[model samples]
Target chain A: SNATKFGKVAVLLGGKSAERAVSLDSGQAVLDALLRSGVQAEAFDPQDRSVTELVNYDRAFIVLHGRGGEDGQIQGVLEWLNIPYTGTGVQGSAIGMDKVKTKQIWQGSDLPTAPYRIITKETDLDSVIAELGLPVIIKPVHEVGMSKFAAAIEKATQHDAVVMAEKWITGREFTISFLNGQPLPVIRLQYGIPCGLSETEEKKLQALCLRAFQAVGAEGWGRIDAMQDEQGNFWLLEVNTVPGMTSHSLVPKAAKAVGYSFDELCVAILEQTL
Target chain B: SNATKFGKVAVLLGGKSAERAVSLDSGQAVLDALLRSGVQAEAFDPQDRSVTELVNYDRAFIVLHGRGGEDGQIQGVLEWLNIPYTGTGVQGSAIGMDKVKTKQIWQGSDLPTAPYRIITKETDLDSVIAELGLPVIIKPVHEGSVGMSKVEKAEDFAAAIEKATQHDAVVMAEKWITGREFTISFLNGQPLPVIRLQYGIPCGLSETEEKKLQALCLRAFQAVGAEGWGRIDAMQDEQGNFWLLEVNTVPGMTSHSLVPKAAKAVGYSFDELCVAILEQTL
Candidate 1:
């Protein structure tokens, strides 16, 4: 059985990354959705499978998240194979996936994000706290996260000259999904070791997230994850055009909140190609 | 009759862009090099062939210059196919190809480009020339030299702005720095000996000036996320600093090309340079 409107599809997942397990879960959920919508889909794990094997598909419904899958890697693969894949293209996918570049672009556009920092040999603790305050989340830019700020600083010098003190936004964490221009119902995520947001704050997520979506040049559809400070403004942690697809995933949950079934959302996304 | 190392390589070239002719010439030249170096490579124009046919190849040597090739499309395709292609990856190719974003990154790094002016809503004129001067070059950031002008006289500024903006809403006026342009070839990650351009003017950069030019060019090329091999164009300033102009990720490889000329000056043969660029992929 197939959606007929759409042809053969590949649910790409399980690359050699830390999040490979999550990708497997997300890929399976997406596969089921495609099948329910009467579309032909197959689970293609690049970890074991060769990309040359992907020539059988008409288009790609990428469910692989993180690193190789979400970064421009898989998008580049699909483009070389000359197959259409869902979510952002090369530049958009790269911008969406690049934390540093995303922050750079967002800052250039004057969009609000968690205050930025970079740890160098001469970086100071006193100044960091002056801006970010006590209990700031300290981590490196490319990888590695969280440690006692002072000790992490000491240990950081022993290995890498990179680290940062991110001012913790002590508020509610919320993630919302966007379907094209229209905003889906907000998924407040009561949500993940999370804060209290009012109705006015609720309206703010729609505007900020959409602006973020346009900022990264994300087309078709995607989700933006953010946190709300008590002052009715939200600090964007990051934007994911190539987000996960587990039943409990934020985008799917938010999709259900707005009355779109898992299958309906799947078709809606694939239909964009038409 | 093969390099044994590179099995069934596809020489990807030509595209549906302005640079298609240049890519065709470059691709054919690259194919000959691959052949002379005893690697089994065949011509495959992306504008003509399906990338699915490329499934038969082990790796790729992308020669597509403009838009679809050098930009991101073919790089994205090659990444998805799990094929090891020549030149930049999806991210690197894009950073190299995006002139606007490339300038943004370099400007942030404080690499010297010509001082620039944009005609925003407020539209100031005297200050624009005050910084960059009367012989400022104006052009669209995305397009090439065609819609450009060097409005020499201060009185003629208004007419140039009107025509420049019709094709592109945002036209940038840049200070003149091209007194004697220099091109530096960066093979792999190393900058080569520089070349003095334009015999018409007949002026040259000193050996020390060439060193600084190479240093700035290398930094600018590396900052743009390019690897393997690339080239950069620059001009030695009146004060002897090299101002970066543009970075080319996959430069042309004709026998008389600047890359080979620089490489030859530094004791690298044409075949050796080709092998080195390919080996960098390894």
Candidate 2:
């Protein structure tokens, strides 16, 4: 009777973050899956749009990624309205979205991650580069995804980009997903060409990736990214709360390898709601 | 005109914490200073009482320490009622109250602090001791003051205590605050030390105390990157070395409170203390 009484569910999508386009794609996929599953669903973009108009909906599936939506600002508004939404609570979401803060937690927990420095408006850029050395990744500590000139700051010109500095690792990339409290199948992401790894390095990287995921207290589903240096040390890069779901997406492929069909995976995600 | 229309402030005091007695003393001193300066002031205990019942004042001077009051829960209710309060926002207050989170900020800023470990409900106590070694200070991370235990494994006793785990979920095991202990105060970068260093060392703690005092005072103050009015405490070991203990966002202001004595030594008056602290909120 409760399931039958449930009204329309609004899939919130697209935001001012760099991952806006990907969020739109994920939003569409969620909408299609929800409709086929016999639940009435609609897509609503919160950008330059009124959330007050969607107050009639039974529940809000916040499919938006990056800053405003995922970082607890919008969640604070939802809390004020006393609406039951999906994903992490306000404090967890805000801390998860902050790279510097999350890294601090990781370090505190004795979890391995790439060394990084936070650069605010008051940071001495030249001194930081001299201290952290070069080939560092620079991005806004609170923003998600890579934008133009937001990543890969060299030792020579670290002054150009501002916000935060991270030690750049040159190695193979891998992702591991977690659902509820358990780890999903691990997925290795090769940017250009595929190179097979020895068993030892593979096991080591897997442990590092899993530790990074657990360090942030991630529940439900999320993705962890790691890079292995030439010498065989796997350094964690970042964790994405919502990974992309395109045909070329690594997580979906990893999900399929574990015997989950594409539709099954999508339906499973929707079932994870509160 | 509106500012002048506001009644003289009353500092709230006394709560259900181990530090309640000290807080009462601090509140009285604040009351005395305000009254001495011809500023109408009084002390109000919030225990079994509502702050709203006091209709005589326009604002609150919060002097409650530890647990429920100092944390953001009180601040949250105040903000909802559109009342202006002192000392950090809700987020900052919450963060400062929890040592586990506060250490993260210190680590992020690359500030100097002793290595420590945190154990949750699922932690294996024996394994933690094996890794960090003995003479470690075990404490509940959120509770302030030293309601803590110092465990040094003499033989196999450590294992027995480990097996008999008690209390709440999260606990912190940190290296002892060895070397000399000092407290520093800062009012918008104008540094002061109210009580100075009162060393608890066995051998007549007078000889090397002054030097230890100045050094720890400077480093611990800078460690938090503290602004406005606050205090820094440091501890020294037998080798005459100093290490930071903690930063007090709202240091006690009793007759024995270090901040007032430190401010007085610098020739600042009681009225100056009230006005300066009020300016920090602004």
Candidate 3:
């Protein structure tokens, strides 16, 4: 007998970014889950029409990721129209999308992060190499979608790559989820198998990831990706304001570890709104 | 030899703020002074018309104070339009207007300032008095006009006085400037005269009351982070310790204004003032 059960929910997706296809998949899954759970829901692609007109809907379940959707542009437009949407606000979204700025914030907050420096075309490649030794992870300042990121390693004196330096960590990647302010179970990501860390390493990574989340002023639900090096130091890679919802996505796997089904996880996410 | 000695200059002023009248006066004075110096200058009141339409001028002399005109709003609009206007940019203008936020920056920079506390309606008046003591200057967070400020003493703590805490989310109680206040001017890192300040303390203090006007403006100018063109207002107390009152991104240029007087002391005529300010950006 909930009033919202009868209300209409618009799940926005399919942005003008590399992640459009992925977002469409995520949006359709959410739409199906919402309808199956006895809730009135419709899928809307932000690329088609204006988001301002969609303010009349009861609520917006934003499933869009990357580029203009994940950046502050759409959120700022929605905020001006006074439309309530799921996940982070304009500042949080912009900070999360900008990899260079987020790392600065993390460092400023004294959070555990890998030593990284930004590299642009104007950067002095010789001095940067001299400062931070070779074998670093280099990516675009802002890149989205799976397999779209460019990571390369340069030898100590090689001056071919136009990228920033990061002390490459060789370990299993982990995704940690948070609903409201509570932390869910940590999910360790591997190439083929489900590899669990020792209790000591798990606790340290969880604490560091949660601190990184708070440092970015994350609201609603978000996920943090971190890699634990051989030295047992967990280096925060990046924060995802709008995480993926695919069956093989890290978030779903993390939720399943805590006994929440994929449907239950989707329902729980929809329930948590700003 | 000059391409256009009487260049087309626009004096932008009179915004939608409480200091509209003062801004209008400053604009009119600037226009008249430019005209007197054989330079062509016209006054454009931003309150009456859109600033976007009045961008064809060679240079803009901003005379607006407070609100949208002075507090970064107009500056941001001008920046987006690619107009080379006078005064500080959006960040400097905004930080200058917010007293508490700038005070934090000043404290972070280890600059000497008067002890103060942010006062809100929820603030305990008795405890504030116990901490900072009496005869403190209470100011509205955003307003720049002097009449809006009050020097509240312990004896005159009326409940209605709490109504003075309007507009600003956080009003600050500062130790009153019990010394001579001076305004320092800078033009491209070169400092001008340290014009002695004279507030309207009984008998309506005028520009003639000040005895000595020396060239000590450089020290105070360097103290505050004023690059390009800006003004720093400082005060020296009974013990002869100079304290910075506030920094103005855009100083007033009335006929009797302290900045103009300081400029004149350094052998810069009214025409030279216009040309010097224009030379700053170039």
Candidate 4:
């Protein structure tokens, strides 16, 4: 009954964004998962096919993972088409796609992001250092979180934009993917110090991750890639509405650890559609 | 050459929003003005035809005042379709459409606006009146600065929130600012002469006050990516500190509208203003 409830589900994939291949991979994965789950799903590529064709379907399993796909534009297209595709909606996708605006948002919310200043073509680099203070990151967030992990987390506030600066981040380097405000699983060697997390600390980390997600008002079944620091604090990187199904993707691995098979995880994400 | 330079322009209008009727009015008026100016502009309601049909046209003079029209969403539609539409691009349009996000951005930029707080069942309603102080305004964060009313008494807030919550899911409580209201228009990145607005009282702000207010309005307008011509409104407190309020992306374009009034004062006729805005493109 749950299988047929979705009617004709479209496995939306193969966008011409930076992650087209990955989207297809994820699409195939989701398609296969849905097929295995007894749900009727098919590949619906917006790049090659008109969205008007989507009208025939009850829902879409969105697997877009880059630029045109991950951004809100596709969301708008799906919205106009009146087909309830899975993953992030328009606002969060748009806001999350812009890097500087994300930090600007966090700055206004009084969220604990790293100290940084915006730069423009006519902006004075001298004034930047003088005003923002030294060792202040030019393109970044503050997480008291480590190297690449910290950078990744800082990115969630502004997923992708041309905003660039000498970024700074220093953390124990760990991540967690939230499912509808619930933590899936912890990533990296540093979960809650020497080995793993107590039920309480992981719960606290989950609470912080939800807060970070709310900073962007993110919704739908999406993955927020975030990192933890020495305090096991979570800093938001970006909310991945279009979670990548990569060679080493966390959404899949994390989904597995939480006792959700690929079919379960992919199908469950579709439930977030309004 | 300039008249023909515009070729055939599509004055986009009407949509599924509370402002649909307003968009129709603005569209008709804009169409009238553009035609009177000798520019070949015509009405193209997206409700009737696909935007893809616009390959028959050259540029677009966007006047849709609702939904995807009001937000940067329609601009994105025009963008992918390679049709240059008037008003701000996607960034400004999107940010301007969101009331709370706009204020958040203003706060982030350190631009002065009233301090506001988001409301939810879990949030302490009593503390809002306590923290933001008395006389708070309740509003839905995403809609057109609508369903907002000033609440002086703590008891009044519940009703105000009920009224707003009926309209929106994400309602916000904002601190009230008491001051002279002003609306300033800017075209082509330059601020026009100022217009002080009052319902009961007739007054004019000092030159010093106007300059300061104009600077704040200009900076805020540009920051949101609102280009071409639009309007900015604010409240000047008794202490002379202006609190930014509304940044109109597709402000009404009636001949006697505030923007036209300000334009008329600056030696630019209504026709001149429209042409000037059109010139801002490409």
Best by DockQ: 4
* lDDT: worst 10-residue window of model 3 chain A: A144-153
Q: How many residue pairs clash in each candidate?
A: 13, 13, 0, 10
Give me the overall lDDT of model 3: 0.64
TM-score of each: 0.77, 0.64, 0.54, 0.87
- Give the C-alpha miss distance for residue A18 in model 2, angstroms: 6.7
User: Model 4, which residues run further than 4 Å from truth?
Assistant: A2-4, A120-126, A129-162, A189-197, A230-234, B2-4, B198-203
lDDT of each residue in B8-83, candidate 3, tens digit only: 6777888777778878888887777767766667888766765655556666667787766555556554553455
Which sequence of candidate numbers ranks them by TM-score, best first?
4, 1, 2, 3
Using TM-score, give the best candidate's number: 4
RMSD of each: 5.4, 7.4, 10.2, 4.5
Off by over 4 Å in 1: A40-43, A47-53, A113-176, A181-208, A227-235, A257-259, B1-9, B15-17, B39-41, B47-59, B77-85, B110-182, B195-203, B206-209, B235-243, B255-257
Return the clash pairs for model 3, or none: none
- lDDT of model 1 at residue A224? 78
The DockQ scores of all candidates, in the order shown, are 0.36, 0.12, 0.07, 0.37
Per-residue alpha-carbon lDDT of model 4 for A33-79, expressed as tens digits? 88888888888887888655777788888787766656566666556
**Alpha-carbon error at B137 in model 3, in Å?**
17
- Candidate 4 scores a C-alpha RMSD against the true structure in Å of 4.5
The count of backbone overlaps in candidate 4 is 10
Ranking by DockQ: 4, 1, 2, 3
For residues B1-282, write the lDDT of model 4, one tens digit per residue. 656789888888786667778788878888888889899988988777765567678888877775767676667666645677777876677778777788877887778889889998789977887789988888887775568888999678777887788778888888988877888888887787788775211237777877787899998887666888788888888887889887878877754467788777778877777787777666
Fnat for the candidates in order: 0.45, 0.08, 0.00, 0.24
